[PDB]
Design a protein around this ligand. Structure first.
Ligand code: ADP
Lengths: 99, 93, 370
């Protein structure tokens, strides 16, 4: 901020305004904050140590009900579809060792 | 002297006008005021038709310029690339 | 991206430069190139051949001063490269031409080749990140703060009037004659010869410029004063001599209002203003007459603005308020306007990037010339 004050006090507005506008940190942080509660406390561990299919039943329903908060956070289409296939990837891995 | 003119070839245009002529003369005689009535008539009618024609003459630059100019005040076209590309400096005064 | 835009105001006589955002141009010097005339004999002499700036001004006797730009058109590009390179030297900027976008002032109606080759010079030898060529009148009005009005400038090699409407400089009303400061000095040199005093050396033409800058004025009545014998004030040369001028001091800048003295069918300054205003939309004439801005060093003569008012009143229609402004930074008008323009966030979108220049070429510059 002291360097920014140097450039502001020296009437050079370029680097000062670009320090917040040219840097995409502001929009990156706001999208991060939009996805911030969605990424904290994710029940993937419910899927990790689940060897019994009943644990997997309740686990699958639990993870998707926690994922239900993407209605308010603008989730993308293709991102959600690759997400679903990733969920099925770990489902398949768990079932492979289960068999 | 009310006038109504319609024209609609590939469009629609209507001219509606009238002049509230006001003139006087003493009724001197009959033939004198007959042809004198014609004198006032020929005066007002030649005047009115001519004036109407010149109103049509001075319309590209006055009446239409009250509505829509033919060219902007800068007498050039619009550099759409300029306006869209950047703000002309309108933010600065 | 770069550090900061450098506003380099050219000029056929005095180049002016500095960074954008600056208040006044910190670096100003004459636009000439002086190389020695005599013979290097003694060792330990002034090393180096071409001199520009204060050193060329100091040892003025040795040099054979020439100008690379005349009438806003570059005649020699090598001397211009050395001048621009001098601007980026340790004596003026101490920077590199690789981290600074460049705002470049340029006079109207000039050939395309000026912008083209000047752009090649910058983007190739200097490799600047972004170049932006602009007018000069637009910058002067931006420097005064107002927005619609004509701009009457007379620098060292050009003079023109531009009716600017909110920034859109009307390109169909820019009258431009080539009678400016340097030519007035040239005609003054001719009159000094007719007085008896001869000055013909290239490094003496500068003394003629000094005389023009501190001993000439403009007569209100152009003829009534010619029919009288003035006080004939003296003048001290750098040599220490004495020159009595006489009538050769008011008739010398009279050239600007009548280029018949030089023998040319051009017009005066007043006619350039009146024709620039009258070749515009009739709905803006009163607004333009109420806003006239002067700039350029040739508008510094004594009695200049007053005579301009008299002349314009003789040419403008009756009972129309004529108003000529004359700020105190007529020498720095285009540079201060460049400092205001380039210091804005829209300048990022207003320049030409180096990548773009490498893609399209000179056509990209003519495309985005405004
Ligand atoms: N006090 C003065 N009176 C008259 N002319 C002057 C005076 N000072 C400078 N000049 C002339 O004005 C010119 C400066 O204009 P300049 O800044 O060169 O315009 P540009 O930079 O656009 O060419 C100089 O060439 C000089 O001859």
């Amino acid at each position: 901020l002291l360097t920014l004050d140097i450039l502001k006090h020296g009437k050079r507005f370029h680097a000062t305004v670009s320090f917040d506008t040219d840097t995409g940190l502001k929009q990156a942080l706001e999208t991060v904050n939009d996805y911030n509660p969605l990424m904290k406390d994710f029940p993937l561990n419910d899927l990790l140590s689940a060897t019994e299919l009943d644990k997997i039943r309740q686990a699958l329903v639990a993870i998707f009900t926690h994922l239900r908060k993407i209605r308010n956070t603008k989730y993308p289409i293709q991102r959600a579809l690759r997400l679903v296939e990733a969920i099925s990837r770990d489902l398949s891995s768990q079932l492979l060792k289960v068999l | 002297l009310k006038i109504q003119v319609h024209y609609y070839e590939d469009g629609n245009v209507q001219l509606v006008s009238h002049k509230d002529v006001q003139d006087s003369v003493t009724v001197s005689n009959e033939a004198q005021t007959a042809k004198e009535f014609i004198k006032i008539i020929e005066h007002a009618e030649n005047e009115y038709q001519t004036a109407i024609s010149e109103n049509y003459q001075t319309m590209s630059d006055t009446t239409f310029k009250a509505l829509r100019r033919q060219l902007p005040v800068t007498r050039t076209k619009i550099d759409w690339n300029k306006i869209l590309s950047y703000k002309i400096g309108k933010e600065m005064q | 991206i770069a550090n900061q835009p450098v506003v380099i105001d050219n000029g056929s006589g005095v180049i002016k430069a500095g960074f954008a955002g600056d208040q006044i141009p910190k670096y100003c010097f004459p636009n000439y190139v002086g190389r020695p005339k005599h013979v290097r004999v003694m060792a330990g002499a002034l090393e180096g051949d071409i001199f520009i700036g204060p050193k060329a001004e100091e040892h003025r006797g040795l040099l054979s001063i020439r100008y690379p730009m005349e009438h806003g058109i570059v005649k020699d590009w090598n001397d211009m490269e050395r001048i621009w390179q001098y601007v980026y030297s340790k004596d003026q900027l101490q920077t590199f031409s690789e981290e600074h976008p460049v705002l470049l002032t340029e006079a109207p109606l000039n050939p395309r080749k000026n912008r083209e080759r000047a752009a090649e010079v910058f983007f190739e030898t200097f490799n600047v990140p972004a170049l932006f060529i602009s007018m000069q009148a637009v910058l002067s009005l931006y420097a005064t703060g107002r927005t619609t009005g004509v701009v009457l400038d007379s620098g060292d090699g050009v003079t023109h009037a531009v009716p600017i409407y909110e920034g859109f400089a009307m390109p169909h009303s820019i009258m431009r004659i080539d009678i400016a400061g340097r030519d007035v000095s040239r005609f003054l040199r001719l009159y000094l010869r007719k007085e008896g005093y001869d000055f013909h050396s290239s490094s003496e033409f500068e003394i003629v410029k000094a005389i023009k800058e501190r001993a000439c004025y403009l007569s209100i009545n152009p003829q009534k004063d010619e029919t009288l014998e003035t006080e004939k004030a003296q003048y001290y040369l750098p040599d220490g001599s004495t020159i009595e001028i006489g009538p050769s001091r008011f008739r010398a800048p009279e050239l600007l209002f009548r280029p018949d003295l030089i023998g040319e069918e051009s017009e005066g300054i007043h006619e350039v203003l009146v024709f620039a205003i009258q070749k515009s939309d009739m709905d803006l004439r009163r607004t333009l007459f109420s806003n006239i801005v002067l700039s350029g060093g040739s508008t510094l003569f004594k009695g200049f603005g007053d005579r301009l008012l008299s002349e314009v009143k003789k040419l403008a229609p009756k009972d129309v308020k004529i108003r000529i402004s004359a700020p105190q930074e007529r020498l720095y008008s285009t540079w201060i306007g460049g400092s205001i323009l380039a210091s804005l966030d829209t300048f990022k979108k207003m320049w030409v990037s180096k990548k773009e220049y490498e893609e399209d070429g000179a056509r990209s510059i003519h495309r985005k010339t405004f």
